[PDB]
Nucleic acid binder design. Structure first.
Lengths: 106, 124, 150, 169
RNA sequence: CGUGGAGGUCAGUGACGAAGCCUAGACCGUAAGGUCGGGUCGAACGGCCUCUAGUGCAGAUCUUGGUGGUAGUAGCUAGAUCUAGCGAAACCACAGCCAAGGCUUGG
RNA sequence: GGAAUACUGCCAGCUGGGACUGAGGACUGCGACGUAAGUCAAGGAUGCUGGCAUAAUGGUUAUAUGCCGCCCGUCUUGAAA
RNA sequence: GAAAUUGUUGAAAGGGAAGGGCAUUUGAUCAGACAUGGUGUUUUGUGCCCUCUGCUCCUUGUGGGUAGGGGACGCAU
């Protein structure tokens, strides 16, 4: 096919933060097409994978990934807190985060 | 096996202003100045040592690989470990020569004890 | 057959029994499953048997889209609504052991053709449902899997 | 009496005791089970005791009692033990009879371990003839490096090459 | 916990390299501290149980030594203000682009 | 006249989705279902299956980016300077 | 042969600051088992096993130590 995308796309935004103290445990995620929390409830628990490049070829491929889940809803507009294993670099606020579809429970 | 080994705090504490001065060293010491920021614990300053960091009596003193450490000199000394090969692992005090290490090695594999620091002073 | 020789702690009685799996409502054999993960990702296969290790079994049928007989975990699969008829297909010929392992073992191929024929012949009873298992699946633009109905 | 000999060993020092970096302190006596000098394993304060020990032969169960307490040159009795792990264990819990559970429980273990040790040492006797360990003294190092450096320096190494090539021409 | 010496004890360790110092190596201690791996070095040294002190450093316009910034400066010997050569000190927590609240909010 | 619906409530009613933890380490206890033997969701988690030794992963480091933190000590504590 | 302090070579950032705290990122970089078995089952030699024959010391006991002639439980295969 032309389009093999199996994953909704999204934007990384912030770490969770107070007005001053951030808490870079849990990235906050914006999801494309979710405008509302009850839309979120579908996504909670899928596997987010942040994907980027490294010019030094590591495993035989220069494309690297961090994985992680999506835990709970955030705010009324449908931000969704995700926590990766190794926290997102904060180099990327507003970079495209991919939200796969599985675990699949419907 | 053993529980999962958790340090509670893995970063060595440094002495306030250690780096801005050499005449001050890196070994933690208290701040007795009643005005100081590190003593009164203002936000954003270094973290004191305090008891709550004390680790888990189960896994305390455990080296990562899961054994403990016990520090031996001659073979007659490691023979105390015939019993515990599952808890203690023994390593070879620095001043041992390269003559006797190889002995503690051979005999320490026969007993099946883990030596944390083989390869010290020994080529092939 | 020695004595424990260095004493350890005996376990306690673990009170957690092993109780059989409860599949979700939307899986009954013959659903068209879309895969999610694996080299076969995003394809469309047919759900036949629910094995005993808590995974499903799926066939392409390999004659069509390339997916052979395979064991596949329940959670990574999306369950469509479009049924078929499995009833004229044998089942029990294989289970966890048939997939235990240690190129191709000609037997495996044989079974492949066996289920192949009958099953495909069943599929030909529906229009286009032949192709619909050939083509891959993918989100298109604007697609909103929280609004979709599979 | 014995509890005193203990408490003396638990405040003053034994000739032998270790105090590993964690809180616990071994007992390096040749004769004891468990190798930790604590009330019930320290052979010096018991007066009734039994261990297992290799001779370079098989594994003699050594025993003592109160009665030879004053006659050390011969205090420890001794027994050999079979090559049947099964029969061994039966010999051990045989001789020990109403000796309390400690020594059957543990002595059995020391037997198991030393037997395994034997078996290993037997394997390792048969293995890896190759690549022995070796040390190199420090001044051996220093000497080698320098003398090498001078070796190269002495050979301008191209003059040889070219002159050999003019040769070949 | 650590430092100097002492009385025991490890039949402790040591020219096959003791101390010491370096370390973008490791582990242990919550921490004081500890223990190993490389590297340089050359002759003594350490752990446990106890004794005894001239025993623990950031400060003292601290003492003594070494160094700097100040600066090749202010300047003073050959050459025609220039050049060459020679060469200080006072002072030094740090560093000094704005404006209003007195770090913050703007430029 | 006759039902219904919202509102506040009740349930020792049913059921789906997600997260974080798995402390303890023979048995003893309280129990529930059992014809009984036994069973069990009852005094703290187990099973299955995947990846790995030119390992898996782990670290130190210099930088990066996000937010936070100004110069220490003494002395009148109060423009706390 | 330490530090302060300086030179060179390389790294890295910088143009308006250095330093610290929580967290990952990227680069470099280092470590990363003489693990190589276990439970059996069989074939076959040998001997501390079997059967003869002794000898010895003493805590004289449900003990050690040891020799020779042979034969088929530990060990090797």
């Amino acid at each position: 096919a032309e389009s093999h995308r199996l994953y909704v796309k999204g934007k990384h935004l912030s770490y969770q933060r107070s007005k001053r103290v951030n808490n870079p445990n849990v990235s906050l995620i914006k999801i494309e097409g979710v405008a509302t929390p009850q839309d979120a409830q579908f996504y909670l628990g899928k596997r987010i994978a942040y994907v980027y490049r490294a010019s030094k070829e590591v495993r035989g491929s220069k494309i690297r990934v961090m994985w992680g889940k999506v835990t709970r809803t955030h705010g009324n507009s449908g931000v969704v807190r995700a926590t990766f294993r190794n926290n997102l670099p904060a180099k990327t606020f507003g970079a495209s985060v991919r939200i796969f579809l599985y675990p699949s429970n419907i | 096996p053993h529980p999962k080994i958790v340090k509670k705090h893995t970063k060595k504490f440094k002495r306030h202003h250690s780096d801005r001065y050499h005449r001050v060293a890196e070994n933690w010491r208290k701040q007795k100045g009643i005005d100081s920021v590190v003593r009164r614990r203002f936000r954003g300053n270094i973290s004191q040592p305090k008891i709550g960091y004390g680790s888990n009596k189960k896994t305390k003193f455990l080296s990562p690989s899961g054994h403990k450490t016990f520090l031996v000199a001659n073979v007659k000394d490691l023979e105390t470990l015939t019993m515990h090969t599952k808890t203690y692992a023994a390593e070879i005090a620095h001043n041992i020569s390269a003559k006797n290490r190889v002995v503690i090695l051979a005999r320490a594999k026969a007993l099946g004890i883990k030596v944390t620091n083989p390869k010290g002073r020994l080529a092939l | 057959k020695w004595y424990p020789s260095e004493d350890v702690a005996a376990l306690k009685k673990t009170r957690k029994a092993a109780r059989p799996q409860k599949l979700r409502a939307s899986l009954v054999p013959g659903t068209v499953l879309i895969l999610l993960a694996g080299r076969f990702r995003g394809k469309r296969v047919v759900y036949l048997k629910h094995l005993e290790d808590n995974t499903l079994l799926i066939s392409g049928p390999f004659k069509v889209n390339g997916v052979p007989l395979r064991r596949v975990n329940a959670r990574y699969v999306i369950a469509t609504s479009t049924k078929v008829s499995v009833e004229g297909v044998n089942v029990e010929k294989f289970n966890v052991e048939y997939f235990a392992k240690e190129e191709i073992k000609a037997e495996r191929v044989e079974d492949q053709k066996v289920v192949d024929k009958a099953l495909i012949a069943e599929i030909k009873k529906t229009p286009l449902l032949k192709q619909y298992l050939s083509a891959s699946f993918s989100l298109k633009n604007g697609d909103k899997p929280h609004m979709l109905k599979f | 009496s014995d509890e005193i000999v203990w408490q003396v060993i638990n405040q003053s020092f034994c000739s032998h005791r270790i105090k590993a970096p964690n809180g616990q302190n071994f007992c390096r006596n040749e004769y004891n089970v468990t190798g930790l000098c604590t009330r019930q394993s320290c052979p010096l304060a018991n007066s009734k005791y039994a261990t297992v020990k290799c001779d370079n032969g098989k594994l003699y169960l050594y025993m003592k009692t109160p009665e030879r307490a004053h006659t050390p040159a011969k205090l420890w009795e001794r027994i050999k033990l079979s090559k049947n792990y099964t029969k061994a264990l039966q010999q051990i819990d045989e001789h020990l009879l109403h000796w309390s559970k400690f020594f059957r429980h543990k002595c059995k273990q020391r037997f198991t371990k030393l037997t395994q040790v034997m078996i290993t040492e037997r394997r390792l006797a048969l293995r890896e003839e190759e690549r022995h360990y070796v040390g190199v003294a420090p001044k051996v190092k220093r000497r080698e490096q320098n003398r090498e450096r001078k070796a190269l320096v002495a050979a301008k190494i191209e003059k040889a090459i070219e002159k050999e090539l003019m040769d070949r021409l």
